Amino acid sequence: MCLKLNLLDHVFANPFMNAAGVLCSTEEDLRCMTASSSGALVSKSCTSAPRDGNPEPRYMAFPLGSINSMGLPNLGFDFYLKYASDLHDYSKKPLFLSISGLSVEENVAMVRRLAPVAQEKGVLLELNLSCPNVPGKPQVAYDFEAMRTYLQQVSLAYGLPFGVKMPPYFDIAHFDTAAAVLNEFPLVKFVTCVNSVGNGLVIDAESESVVIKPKQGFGGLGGKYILPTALANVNAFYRRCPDKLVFGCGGVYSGEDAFLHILAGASMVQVGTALQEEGPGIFTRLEDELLEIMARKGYRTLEEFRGRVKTIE
Amino acid sequence: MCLKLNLLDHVFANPFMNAAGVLCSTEEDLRCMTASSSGALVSKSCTSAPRDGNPEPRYMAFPLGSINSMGLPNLGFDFYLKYASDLHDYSKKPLFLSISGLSVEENVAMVRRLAPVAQEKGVLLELNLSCPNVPGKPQVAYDFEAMRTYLQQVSLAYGLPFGVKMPPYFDIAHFDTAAAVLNEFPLVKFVTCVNSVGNGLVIDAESESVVIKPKQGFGGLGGKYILPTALANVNAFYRRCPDKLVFGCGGVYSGEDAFLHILAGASMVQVGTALQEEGPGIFTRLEDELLEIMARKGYRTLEEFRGRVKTIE
Ligand SMILES: Cc1cc2nc3c(=O)[nH]c(=O)nc-3n(C[C@H](O)[C@H](O)[C@H](O)COP(=O)(O)O)c2cc1C
Ligand SMILES: Cc1cc2nc3c(=O)[nH]c(=O)nc-3n(C[C@H](O)[C@H](O)[C@H](O)COP(=O)(O)O)c2cc1C
Ligand SMILES: COc1ccc2cccc(CCc3c(C(=O)O)[nH]c(=O)[nH]c3=O)c2c1
Ligand SMILES: COc1ccc2cccc(CCc3c(C(=O)O)[nH]c(=O)[nH]c3=O)c2c1
């Protein structure tokens, strides 16, 4: 029938949205996402100041997915805040604003300014924890002490419900440690699993060359390559964080793929590479495909199967 | 034109071999790999005592790859050592023996008894550092202090050149740290990148179920899913460990995929999921396909292009 649902004190037409960084950087992008059939949108992760990002080519796509080292090109936080405060039409769908400062201090400074706009308009914060860390350390979400510091500071500075965007993890002990960190913060109301699978390398056989210019061709992977990774992370955090929502992201190209994310535990389903490749018309297709699978199975709601993946024995 | 390699004081007809765990567990398996056109073979990672492994189903394969949680089923060290010392025909090809003890002591005891056979017969050791350590801690190669303890102890106990099988990493700081640990050990003469991308989750949309029984369906991923991750790891370690060889493993289904691994830096090229799916016939196909790309490009030997991947500016 219809896929509408209520989460975080907002109403959504359906569980689909863009993934941060795809079709969300400019006013044009945001208006295009708002005009789409997606149930929500998220803005490009921002810094306090604008960034040009890395040299091109910095994104490439292939049959099985994509690689990128964008370098966080963005119009700066003042723009995104302005978009949230003055330009977005909340009657069309909810808005998420993603932030990724280069230090804890920059994040705190941005969230102190966002808080009043979140109160006033209901924009929702997604904090991207695959942001840069101090020398010699990995990205913040791969440092669990840094991760706890960031969340402590943002929670105190912001004081309102927010979410976090996570990189994938590959080790059960890491799932346990990461979820335990997140569960220290009651203000963290959603966990988005996953960001790109870090530092892959795509090589063209014909040219004998890497396909993106930054970082000697290394970049984050998205798309078909990453769906079982994504699913694992969604389910691991769904299991571990019962008092939070999980949003799935990674490898969604069809309503069947969305269905699997929801079975794993996803509340909202985010679309990155397939959206970058197909454009915003993908949202109508995904909705139709998800409703078709539901109808064939006899499910009339998302809640009937969310998190209900079956295990053997 | 030729695929021949001379490394580690052995001669190899071509760079292809099985990946540890595939077509390697029984005497029958080992004789099969020996009879194949591969350039070498490796035996199933073993423990001192035989193991039955995890309950079935514990491996599944799909168009894009495989997932497994086998649980290290194996015939025990004494079996593999006997194979190496009494059964293997070294006139056909070289043999690698993989070990994966559950503690540093278990690994030390195996390699002490392997040493004289290594010296006399020329079997080559591959130490699997995805062995679990203490449960609740990450696998050994994701615990850099543990990794260093294992390598110090095995190096002292074995006293001969050996190699290590590494899991993939996803963060530049981890590439840097891992390679620096490895470079502390002059006896580590080769690094095989990569083991399975850990703890993925495949879900079957029709049955709404995971597809393997252990670990609530979580298992390591191989195959097409993981080629760009594999390449990245090969190249990262090739750049960071100039005094060691790198062997590539992950995502090889064709001579083109092998060509990419070799461009990245691979010496030997191991084949896991594709071999498990196609059987040992795959080796003649891979050899033909790789020779065809070399002929098109005018390459006569593998050294012409090994590690010669181009970057952009
Ligand atoms: C071009 C591009 C830019 C992205 N930039 C961001 C970003 O600014 N913030 C973020 O949280 N993730 C970013 N991502 C990651 C995606 O949001 C998503 O987590 C990843 O692409 C996996 O989803 P997919 O398989 O649907 O592509 C970016 C991805 C791409 C492809
Ligand atoms: C059924 C199965 C068993 C495995 N057993 C082992 C093992 O005993 N030792 C090990 O080093 N790697 C093991 N692996 C990992 C493979 O050696 C290889 O690293 C991984 O499958 C990636 O290569 P692929 O993409 O060609 O499958 C196993 C993989 C499979 C599929
Ligand atoms: C790769 O170069 C940088 C440089 C600065 C960054 C600052 C904050 C966040 C990020 C991560 C932004 C991001 C990017 C990106 O813009 O390269 N791509 C992703 O697939 N996920 C992401 O989360 C930064 C990345
Ligand atoms: C999944 O459960 C166990 C249990 C005991 C193990 C002991 C040493 C190494 C390993 C890892 C063996 C392994 C396995 C495995 O046998 O599950 N599969 C892989 O893809 N790569 C590997 O390296 C063990 C794994």
Nearest to A128 by CA among A70, A167, A185, A94: A167
What is the C-alpha to C-alpha distance for residues B89 and B100, in angstroms, rounded to an integer? 24
Q: Is B128 in the pocket of ligand 4 (CB under 6 A)?
A: yes
Task: Give, in order, the Cα–Cα distances in Å from B125 to each of B9, B28, B100, B119, B156.
Answer: 13, 21, 11, 11, 14
Cβ neighbour number for residue A272 with a 10 Å cutoff: 25
Question: How many Å is the Cα radius of gyration of chain A?
Answer: 18
Does B174 share its domain with B214? no
Q: Which domain holds residue B237?
A: 1-53+72-196+223-313
- Hey, is the C-beta of B199 within 8 angstroms of any chain A C-beta? yes
Does B232 share its domain with B109? yes
User: Which residue reads 């003055």 in tokens?
Assistant: A86
Give every CB contact of residue B257 below 8 A, 6+ residues apart in sequence. B227, B251
Q: Is A167 in the pocket of ligand 3 (CB under 6 A)?
A: no
Give me the amino acid identity at A170.
F
Which residues share a beta bridge with A128?
A: A165
- For the record, the structure tokens of B125 come out as 């050791």
Please give the DSSP secondary-structure letter assigned to residue A224: G
CB A282 within 8 A of CB A271: yes
User: Which residue reads 């006139």 in tokens?
Assistant: B91
Taking the CA of B59 as reference, the closest ligand is 2
Nearest to A67 by CA among A275, A217, A274: A217
What is the C-alpha to C-alpha distance for residues B224 and B284, in angstroms, rounded to an integer? 20
Count structural domains, chain B: 2
Query: Does A55 sit within 8 Å of B313, measured CB to CB?
Result: yes
Q: Answer with the one of A222, A237, A268 that is the final residue of a domain.
A: A222
CB A157 within 8 A of CB A128: no
Q: What angle do CA B167, B173, B178 make, to 5 degrees?
A: 45
Nearest to A261 by CA among A1, A4, A16: A16
Q: Give me the helix-helix angle, B227-240 and B172-182, nearest 10°.
A: 50
Give the number of A-B residue pairs with CB atoms closer than 8 Å. 164
- For the record, the structure tokens of A170 come out as 């590959």
Query: What distance lies between CA B134 and its chain's CA centroid?
Result: 23
Nearest chain B alpha carbon to A199: B170
What is the C-alpha to C-alpha distance for residues A261 and A269, in angstroms, rounded to an integer? 7
How close does chain B come to A233, measured CA to CA in Å?
A: 8
Does A63 share its domain with A96? no
Does B105 share its domain with B129? yes
- Hey, is the C-beta of A231 within 8 angstroms of any chain B C-beta? yes
Q: Is B273 in the pocket of ligand 4 (CB under 6 A)?
A: no
CB A110 within 8 A of CB A101: yes
Does B211 share its domain with B81? no
Does A62 share its domain with A42? no
How are beta strands B65-68 and B218-222 bridged, if at all?
A: antiparallel
Does B62 share its domain with B172? no
- Hey, is the C-beta of A293 within 8 angstroms of any chain B C-beta? yes
Taking the CA of B164 as reference, the closest ligand is 2
Task: Give, in order, the Cα–Cα distances in Å from B236 to each of A203, B228, B298.
Answer: 14, 12, 27
Does A123 share its domain with A155? yes
Residue whose CA is at the smallest distance from ligand 1 atom 15: A195
Nearest chain B alpha carbon to A305: B208
**Which of B140, B166, B312, B313 should be substituted to probe chain A, the one whose Cβ sees the most A Cβ atoms within 10 Å?**
B312
Does A264 share its domain with A243? yes
Query: What distance lies between CA B150 and its chain's CA centroid?
Result: 18
Taking the CA of A269 as reference, the closest ligand is 1
Does A240 share its domain with A288? yes
Residues in chain A closer than 8 A to B136 (CB atoms): 173, 176
What is the C-alpha to C-alpha distance for residues A225 and A113, in angstroms, rounded to an integer? 38
CB B98 within 8 A of CB B128: yes
CATH of the domain at B207: 2.30.26.10
CB A154 within 8 A of CB A108: yes
Task: Identify the experimental approach.
Answer: X-ray
B:126-145 residues touching chain A, CB 8 A cutoff: 136-139, 142
Which residues share a beta bridge with A46?
A: A99
Nearest chain A alpha carbon to B216: A311
Query: Does A293 sit within 8 Å of B229, measured CB to CB?
Result: no
CB B230 within 8 A of CB B251: yes
A:43-102 residues touching chain B, CB 8 A cutoff: 55, 57, 64, 67
Does A204 share its domain with A115? no
What is the C-alpha to C-alpha distance for residues B223 and A277, in angstroms, rounded to an integer? 24
Does B212 share its domain with B313? no
Q: What angle do CA A280, A14, A77 make, to 5 degrees?
A: 60
**Test site for ligand 4: of B70, B134, B192, most ligand atoms within 8 A of the Cβ:** B70
Q: What angle do CA B268, B269, B273 make, to 5 degrees?
A: 150
For B170, the closest of A55, A197, A213 (CB atoms) is A197
Cα-to-centroid distance, B166 and ligand 4 (Å): 12
Tell me whether residue B32 is one of the annotated catalytic residues.
Answer: no
Start-to-end CA span in chain B (Å)? 31
CB B44 within 8 A of CB B20: yes
What is the C-alpha to C-alpha distance for residues B291 and B142, in angstroms, rounded to an integer? 37
CATH of the domain at A291: 3.20.20.70
Give every CB contact of residue A33 below 8 A, 6+ residues apart in sequence. A18, A23, A24, A41, A280
Cα-to-centroid distance, B275 and ligand 2 (Å): 11
What is the C-alpha to C-alpha distance for residues B92 and A277, in angstroms, rounded to an integer? 49
State this model's resolution in angstroms: 1.6
For A199, the closest of B171, B209, B309 (CB atoms) is B171
How are beta strands B95-99 and A203-204 bridged, if at all?
A: unpaired
CB A47 within 8 A of CB A74: yes
CB B45 within 8 A of CB B97: no
The torsion region of residue B36 among left (phi > 0), alpha (psi -120 to 50) and beta comes to: beta
- Hey, is the C-beta of A210 within 8 angstroms of any chain B C-beta? yes
DSSP A233-255: HHHHHHHH-TTSEEEEESS--SH
Give every CB contact of residue A72 below 8 A, 6+ residues apart in sequence. A45, A46, A47, A51, A53, A100
How close does chain B come to A291, measured CA to CA in Å?
A: 14
DSSP B186-212: TTEEEEEE---EEEEE-EETTTTEES-
Give every CB contact of residue B255 below 8 A, 6+ residues apart in sequence. B285, B286, B287, B288, B289, B290, B291, B292, B293
Q: Answer with the one of A186, A205, A222 that is the final residue of a domain.
A: A222
